[PDB]
Amino acid sequence: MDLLTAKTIVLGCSAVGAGLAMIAGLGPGIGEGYAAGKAVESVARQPEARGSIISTMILGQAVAESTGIYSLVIALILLYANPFLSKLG
Amino acid sequence: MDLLTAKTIVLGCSAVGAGLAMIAGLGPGIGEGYAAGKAVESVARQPEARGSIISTMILGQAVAESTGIYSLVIALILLYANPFLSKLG
Amino acid sequence: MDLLTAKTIVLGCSAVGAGLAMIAGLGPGIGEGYAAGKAVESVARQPEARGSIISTMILGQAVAESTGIYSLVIALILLYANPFLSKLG
Amino acid sequence: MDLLTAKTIVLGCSAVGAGLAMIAGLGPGIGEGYAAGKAVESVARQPEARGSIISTMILGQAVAESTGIYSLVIALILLYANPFLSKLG
Amino acid sequence: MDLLTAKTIVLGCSAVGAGLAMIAGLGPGIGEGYAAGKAVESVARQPEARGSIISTMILGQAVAESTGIYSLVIALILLYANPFLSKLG
Amino acid sequence: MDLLTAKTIVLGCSAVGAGLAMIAGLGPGIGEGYAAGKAVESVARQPEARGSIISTMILGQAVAESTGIYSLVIALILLYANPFLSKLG
Amino acid sequence: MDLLTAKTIVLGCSAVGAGLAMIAGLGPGIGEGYAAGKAVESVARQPEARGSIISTMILGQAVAESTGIYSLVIALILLYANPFLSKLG
Amino acid sequence: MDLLTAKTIVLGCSAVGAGLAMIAGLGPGIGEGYAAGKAVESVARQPEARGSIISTMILGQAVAESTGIYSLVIALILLYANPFLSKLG
Amino acid sequence: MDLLTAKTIVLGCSAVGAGLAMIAGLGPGIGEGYAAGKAVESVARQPEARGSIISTMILGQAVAESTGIYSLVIALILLYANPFLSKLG
Amino acid sequence: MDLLTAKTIVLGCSAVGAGLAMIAGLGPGIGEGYAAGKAVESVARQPEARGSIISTMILGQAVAESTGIYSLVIALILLYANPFLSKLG
Amino acid sequence: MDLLTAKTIVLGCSAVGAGLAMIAGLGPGIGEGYAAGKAVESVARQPEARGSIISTMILGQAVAESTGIYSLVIALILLYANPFLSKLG
Ligand SMILES: CCCCCCCCCCO[C@@H]1O[C@H](CO)[C@@H](O[C@H]2O[C@H](CO)[C@@H](O)[C@H](O)[C@H]2O)[C@@H](O)[C@H]1O
Ligand SMILES: CCCCCCCCCCO[C@@H]1O[C@H](CO)[C@@H](O[C@H]2O[C@H](CO)[C@@H](O)[C@H](O)[C@H]2O)[C@H](O)[C@H]1O
Ligand SMILES: CCCCCCCCCCO[C@@H]1O[C@H](CO)[C@@H](O[C@H]2O[C@H](CO)[C@@H](O)[C@H](O)[C@H]2O)[C@H](O)[C@H]1O
Ligand SMILES: CCCCCCCCCCO[C@@H]1O[C@H](CO)[C@@H](O[C@H]2O[C@H](CO)[C@@H](O)[C@H](O)[C@H]2O)[C@H](O)[C@H]1O
Ligand SMILES: CCCCCCCCCCO[C@@H]1O[C@H](CO)[C@@H](O[C@H]2O[C@H](CO)[C@@H](O)[C@H](O)[C@H]2O)[C@H](O)[C@H]1O
Ligand SMILES: CCCCCCCCCCO[C@@H]1O[C@H](CO)[C@@H](O[C@H]2O[C@H](CO)[C@@H](O)[C@H](O)[C@H]2O)[C@H](O)[C@H]1O
Ligand SMILES: CCCCCCCCCCO[C@@H]1O[C@H](CO)[C@@H](O[C@H]2O[C@H](CO)[C@@H](O)[C@H](O)[C@H]2O)[C@H](O)[C@H]1O
Ligand SMILES: CCCCCCCCCCO[C@@H]1O[C@H](CO)[C@@H](O[C@H]2O[C@H](CO)[C@@H](O)[C@H](O)[C@H]2O)[C@H](O)[C@H]1O
Ligand SMILES: CCCCCCCCCCO[C@@H]1O[C@H](CO)[C@@H](O[C@H]2O[C@H](CO)[C@@H](O)[C@H](O)[C@H]2O)[C@H](O)[C@H]1O
Ligand SMILES: CCCCCCCCCCO[C@@H]1O[C@H](CO)[C@@H](O[C@H]2O[C@H](CO)[C@@H](O)[C@H](O)[C@H]2O)[C@H](O)[C@H]1O
Ligand SMILES: CCCCCCCCCCO[C@@H]1O[C@H](CO)[C@@H](O[C@H]2O[C@H](CO)[C@@H](O)[C@H](O)[C@H]2O)[C@H](O)[C@H]1O
Ligand SMILES: CCCCCCCCCCO[C@@H]1O[C@H](CO)[C@@H](O[C@H]2O[C@H](CO)[C@@H](O)[C@H](O)[C@H]2O)[C@H](O)[C@H]1O
Ligand code: NA
Ligand code: NA
Ligand code: NA
Ligand code: NA
Ligand code: NA
Ligand code: NA
Ligand code: NA
Ligand code: NA
Ligand code: NA
Ligand code: NA
Ligand code: NA
């Protein structure tokens, strides 16, 4: 096996691996969508409390967002800063 | 391995990886759909407050949209600005 | 490898990638169905607000449709404007 | 590679991608079923508004169906108007 | 590659695509079951409105069934009216 | 490729295709479960209407069952009346 | 190829297919679990009607169990009454 | 093909098939957890009806466990009472 | 085929099969989490009955845990007490 | 087959198998999230009961976590104490 | 097999396995989002309790986050501190 073959296989697997990691993004999309609906209902029933409600929404959603970011970071690593390449040469 | 074989395998894996990443889009669809439903419900109870209600809906949905955008970017990178090619030669 | 073999595998992987991307469309189907169901319910309780109900539904459903559109775009690119072909040689 | 081998792989992959795409159909199935159930409970509680309830059900369901149509079209294309065949010769 | 090999591979990928397509059938199973649940509950509360209740259920369920039917059509095509064969010559 | 190799591959893919299709059975499993629960609650609340409730449960569950049967038929066809065999021999 | 090879591949694919088919069992597990929860709640609110409530629960679960059985029959066929073997040698 | 090769492939496939079957166990876990939750809620409100609330819970959970057992049996057969080795020779 | 190759393939397949089986663990995670949720609001509303509430939760969750254990067992067997090795070959 | 080839393949399958096992962690995330939401709702209603609410939350969440831990243990075993290598040499 | 091929195939499998592990992150995303929605709703209805409402959310979400963190750790190990390399040469 030459070096070109080594990179080809590893980067190819890296591409598939990156795609698989990104699937996790469906979760925050669902969970934050729920926090959004609750906010819509809450500002409707109690308009004078709007600012407090939005802050609580953004705070809650930001936390729910993290595992989305984890997947993104993993993907970007496999794409732009692949740790495997240095192990071949 | 010749270069043409190397690129073929990598770009092919990139196509599959891109499709997998896009699956995440199901999440925001569900989540934002929920936010839509609550707006519908809230507008019926308080038709005069519509403006503030959709305003809150859009803000929430926008945040719920992000992980969909992350996947789209990753896919578009793999298709149009593939980072693996330069590593192959 | 010759050119015909290159395109063949890249296009083949592109077809699968397109199919995978379109799976995301299940999301909006669920989410918008939820908005639809809330519209039905709302029209039944406040029938006088039917016009405001329907227009809120459409708008919210339009927003939740977006990631379904993203996937469709990715799939059509892969099928009709494949950006891998011109990278092979 | 000869034309037949090139056609074989491209069409074989096209068959899998089309099947993958059709998986999206479960979404509208769930979402529309929800709208249907809300319609049932509503014409019972409010039999005076049956016309506008069923009218609202159909419209909301139709919008919810669109991504199912998207995937069906992609499948139909891969099946009957395959765009990869022309890239082969 | 000879014609028998061509047909073998293409048909094999078709059997798999068909199975994948049929997966979508889980959606309508969930949605229509929900519509049935509301119908059961509605018949109990308004025993005399059973006619309109059930009629509403069937109509809504029929709509929800459609994408399960699309998948069944795609599968039957791949099995009994395969469009790929006439391309191999 | 000889006849035996052809039949082996296409039948092998057919077994996998049948199993994939059978995955759709989870849907009616869930949906009909929901209708069952609503029946348990409703019969306990409205004993005078038991027969009308159970009858409503069965009809609704039967409609929900349909896509499960579709899958079962496709699986049965692939297993006992395989339509690919006459295209290979 | 020889007989042993033909049978090996087919029986091998049949193992995976049987496994895939069994995945559908998750549905009835969810659906019936839901019916059980409703039974519990009904019994709590009306302890004297425990026998009647249970009876309704078992009936509704029997119906929900059906597609799990379908998947089980398909898997048992592939393992014990494999219809592909007579198609080979 | 020699006998060892035949045994290796089928058992290899059998191992994968067994794991796929076990995936189904997730359903019963969800459904029974729901029943468990209803028991917890019911025991608190009607503590006089405990035991009767518990026994109903166990019964319902027992029923919901069935498809999980089916998958266990299939997995146990593939691992210990493999019905394919008998066909190899 | 030699015995080292035979064991390599069978164990490799066994590793994947163990991973697949463990996926089932998500179900009990969802179900028991629900039971925990009901327990929390019950002890809030009915502080005196805390002993009975925690007791029902543990029992109910124990039941829901079983299929998770079934999968853990299958996995452990595949890893430490592999029943395939002694049939090679 | 040489030893290095044997180890390569079995470890390669172990990496994939471990990744599959970790997928189960999505369950506890959903489940424990639900428990957390019930705690929030409960602390809002009985702010003074916060301490006992947290205790119950932590308990049930701990139970719900178990199958996540199982999956993790299975993965760490495959990575750090692989039970297959000894069978190969 | 030489060292380069061994490293290559293992790292390649490690990338995929890393991606599979990251899928679990969707769970916490859903779960934490749910807790977020409850906070949004609670904070509105009970302004005097915002402090304990928010703190309870953060705590519960943190517990819900753990299995995502586990998957992240596994992925980071496979990418940056690969345990299989040490066993090849
Ligand atoms: C998930 C989707 C996966 C899709 C995978 C598609 C894989 C396509 C592989 C192509 O590799 C070629 O197919 C050729 C044609 O049938 C072979 O003979 C071709 O190559 C030969 C040398 O190996 C000689 O005939 C000449 O070089 C050339 O004809 C060639 O097998 C092998 O190189
Ligand atoms: C999840 C995604 C998984 C993706 C897996 C993709 C696997 C792609 C395999 C491509 O096959 C390789 O092609 C090289 C180029 O043809 C061969 O080396 C060549 O140069 C080598 C070094 O000289 C020579 O030995 C020969 O030409 C041949 O062996 C090499 O052996 C062969 O394996
Ligand atoms: C943080 C986000 C940053 C986004 C940055 C986007 C930058 C895009 C630069 C162009 O991207 C790719 O670079 C490859 C490498 O230059 C090009 O392949 C070209 O060069 C390769 C060799 O380097 C060859 O193998 C290819 O065949 C040849 O097309 C490829 O076409 C091009 O799309
Ligand atoms: C999920 C996505 C999966 C994507 C998988 C893609 C797999 C690609 C496998 C390619 O296999 C190699 O293809 C080369 C052709 O591309 C062959 O070259 C040969 O035939 C070539 C021409 O086709 C000739 O140039 C020579 O024989 C040598 O160069 C080589 O033997 C063959 O092993
Ligand atoms: C969605 C799933 C799609 C799956 C598509 C699968 C397509 C498979 C195409 C196989 O094509 C054949 O592959 C052989 C290899 O298998 C080639 O010969 C090659 O086999 C070797 C490949 O290097 C040569 O070196 C040897 O001489 C030769 O017999 C042969 O020419 C080629 O036509
Ligand atoms: C989910 C989808 C799964 C799809 C699986 C598809 C599997 C395809 C397997 C490989 O096909 C090989 O194809 C060669 C193609 O050429 C044949 O070649 C043979 O007949 C060839 C000519 O057709 C001859 O050159 C020789 O027998 C050898 O080269 C023969 O079938 C076999 O070696
Ligand atoms: C979910 C999808 C699962 C897909 C599984 C696909 C499995 C494909 C197995 C292919 O098996 C090979 O086929 C070749 C076909 O050619 C055989 O060639 C032999 O018999 C051939 C003719 O059929 C002869 O030419 C020679 O023995 C050699 O060329 C060879 O023995 C056989 O092992
Ligand atoms: C769901 C999983 C399904 C898995 C199915 C796996 C099927 C494997 C069939 C293997 O049959 C063997 O295949 C070899 C090739 O791999 C043949 O190689 C032998 O023949 C070859 C092809 O002609 C070349 O290696 C040289 O010619 C010769 O080694 C060999 O005779 C043939 O018996
Ligand atoms: C999810 C399922 C995964 C399945 C993975 C495993 C698939 C099958 C792998 C290969 O098994 C092959 O069987 C051939 C026989 O059919 C062997 O032939 C050899 O021994 C043969 C005779 O037994 C000889 O002819 C030669 O060594 C060559 O032809 C060959 O070495 C061996 O590798
Ligand atoms: C999740 C499923 C993963 C499945 C992974 C399967 C990986 C491939 C397994 C089979 O590999 C073959 O084994 C043969 C031995 O059985 C080797 O024989 C060789 O050494 C043999 C004798 O030991 C010789 O006869 C020849 O080199 C050829 O016949 C052959 O080269 C090698 O390719
Ligand atoms: C869950 C993911 C699991 C991924 C598992 C990936 C396993 C990859 C195994 C690759 O094994 C190699 O395959 C070569 C063939 O492609 C063999 O070539 C040999 O036998 C070949 C024919 O089978 C011969 O041509 C020569 O011995 C050489 O070319 C070689 O020995 C064998 O080590
Ligand atoms: C998701 C997981 C995906 C895993 C994909 C793994 C793909 C592995 C392809 C391996 O191809 C084999 O090993 C070497 C690659 O170059 C080549 O043999 C050659 O190279 C070896 C490594 O240098 C030597 O040991 C052999 O002697 C020599 O014939 C062999 O022909 C080639 O088929
Ligand atoms: Na998070
Ligand atoms: Na987001
Ligand atoms: Na959107
Ligand atoms: Na739509
Ligand atoms: Na429809
Ligand atoms: Na139906
Ligand atoms: Na049924
Ligand atoms: Na059952
Ligand atoms: Na259980
Ligand atoms: Na647990
Ligand atoms: Na946790």
Residue numbers in the entry:
A (entry chain B), B (entry chain A), C (entry chain K), D (entry chain J), E (entry chain I), F (entry chain H), ...: 1 to 89
Q: What does the literature reporting this entry say, word for word?
A:
In the Fo sector, eight to 15 copies of subunit c are assembled into a closed ring, which rotates around its axis as ions permeate across the enzyme. The c-ring harbors a series of identical ion-binding sites, typically one per c-subunit, which selectively recognize the coupling ion. We describe the structure of a novel type of Na+-binding site in the c-ring of the F1Fo-ATP synthase from F. nucleatum and demonstrate that this enzyme is physiologically coupled to the SMF. The c-ring features two glutamate residues in each of its 11 ion-binding sites, instead of a single carboxylate side-chain as is typical.
We also investigated the influence of the environmental pH on the conformational state of the ion-binding site, by crystallizing the F. nucleatum c11 ring in NaOH-titrated buffer at pH 8.7. The resulting structure, at 2.6 Å resolution, revealed again a locked conformation of the binding site identical to that at pH 5.3, with Na+ and H+ bound concurrently. As we observed in previous structural studies of c-rings, the detergent used in these crystals provides a hydrophobic belt that effectively uncouples the binding sites from the pH or Na+ concentration conditions in the crystallization buffer, in a manner that likely resembles the shielding effect of a lipid membrane. The finding that one Na+ and one H+ can concurrently occupy the binding sites in the F. nucleatum c11 ring raises the possibility that both ions are co-transported across the membrane as the ring rotates. In sum, computations and measurements demonstrate that the protons that occupy the ion-binding sites in the F. nucleatum c-ring, concurrently with Na+, remain bound to the structure throughout the rotation of the ring, and therefore are not co-translocated with Na+ across the membrane.
